[PDB]
Design a binder for this molecule. Sequence first.
Ligand SMILES: CN1CCC[C@@H](CN(C)C(=O)Cn2c(-c3ccccc3)c(C3CCCCC3)c3ccc(C(=O)O)cc32)C1
Ligand SMILES: [Mn+2]
Ligand SMILES: [Mn+2]
Length: 512
Amino acid sequence: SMSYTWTGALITPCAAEESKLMVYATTSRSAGLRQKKVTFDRLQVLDDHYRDVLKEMKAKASTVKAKLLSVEEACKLTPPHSAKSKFGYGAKDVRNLSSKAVNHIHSVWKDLLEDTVTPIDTTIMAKNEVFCVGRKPARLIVFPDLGVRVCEKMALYDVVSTLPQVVMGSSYGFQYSPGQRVEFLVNTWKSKKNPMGFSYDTRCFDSTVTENDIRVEESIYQCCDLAPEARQAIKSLTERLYIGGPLTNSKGQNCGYRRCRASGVLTTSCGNTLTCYLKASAACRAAKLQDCTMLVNGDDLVVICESAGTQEDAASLRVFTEAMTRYSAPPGDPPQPEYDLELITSCSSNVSVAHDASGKRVYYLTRDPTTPLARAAWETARHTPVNSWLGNIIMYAPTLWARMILMTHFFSILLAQEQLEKALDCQIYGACYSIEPLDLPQIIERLHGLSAFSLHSYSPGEINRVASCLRKLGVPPLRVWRHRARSVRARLLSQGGRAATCGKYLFNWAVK
Ligand SMILES: CN1CCC[C@@H](CN(C)C(=O)Cn2c(-c3ccccc3)c(C3CCCCC3)c3ccc(C(=O)O)cc32)C1
Ligand SMILES: [Mn+2]
Ligand SMILES: [Mn+2]
């Protein structure tokens, strides 16, 4: 059946958008191009590999016990900036246990227990994301009302935060920090006698997810030891929200129908991950890949295995891709075999090497600096909820490009404007922090270790990538950034106390 049906009505904005300040942002104006790409008929033929894998997943999920969150708990874990409800309350009311929000949530819950059929309304919107130079359309976000989003947490928060790591073990990508991800990948690579690996990424993964996939996910969740009420709500949520439902735009008009994965529900990330893991493990078996190890974050997959030779590997990946296509998930680009860990890119990121103070080799996670640089450029002009600059400084703090350019530029703009002690909002790992720039040294030490302030002798490929990137975007080269940073460091050190600590740790690399 069709991933989507459309009525004719447009996907409309809810606010003042802006598609430029080179660097652009996606808007609702481009939503029609996205609608085209994500609209198609799915075909799926399962086989005994798929079935054998699923059976093993269920046997693991059957050892998981999960509880209901109370309304109260679910209210307290609602994110502070999520969309206000149609029925008269917002995120802030939910979190402060307003009687209006609580009585309406209890009523949504009771309706889920009592009605297991009526499709549930979702709003469709175009996501506003900054990119770099061609132009890609806006991604679509599809979410139900806030009261339903609280009930999803009641039914499933304990399941989605416990089950996946038990079912997928070390392949569950979301349990790792960047350093931990690197350690998994490097250890896996070094365990093979002749390592080969590849990344796979599915072409419109949300749209490839079928009704059967979503029902299979529910059946995994029902292997858990759950309270009766939980089982009924999870079934009712599966039938009324997860498999499909109607879409309505920001102006309350009927946009169409969805018969595929919603991007804006609690189970999206866990479901996608479980479903990809299931099809990818089955596809490794069809392909007959030797000593296979997988890392999965949504539909981003790395596989690392024993090479069987050059032409053998190339053919084996074709058989893998064929199997994945039969299971409903063709790739955006065909996967390529790699014999260098550094060349495998997934979740937009890759492993690279540098040296610590003692001269020990140290592996760290990096990425192409183009999009992060563009995004930080945008937040120099405008101002966001997410502060992607700061998040990137935190997650990629050991990288050459974050230390030399991102850290430098932003502590300079902060000295200039005297905003050192002003806290900034910052979305990292699905949660919104209030970050004080002088807190960074401690945050980076906690996330990456002290070696992050001390790494040198980076790999020549990484240095050249940063350098080509600066040149392509019009930003000063690295010699300029070393000079500026000597200046920024000097100032911070004059300011004493905590700002002196920033200068000492964050810019120790600039000293002569
Ligand atoms: C004539 N030339 C210099 C003045 C204005 C400039 C406009 N451009 C292309 C930029 O500003 C590019 N750019 C950009 C930039 C612009 C667009 C996309 C990506 C980076 C940045 C970002 C780098 C990372 C921190 C955030 C600013 C930037 C920083 C400093 C400087 C600088 O010249 O000192 C330039 C930077 C063009
Ligand atoms: Mn994809
Ligand atoms: Mn992906």
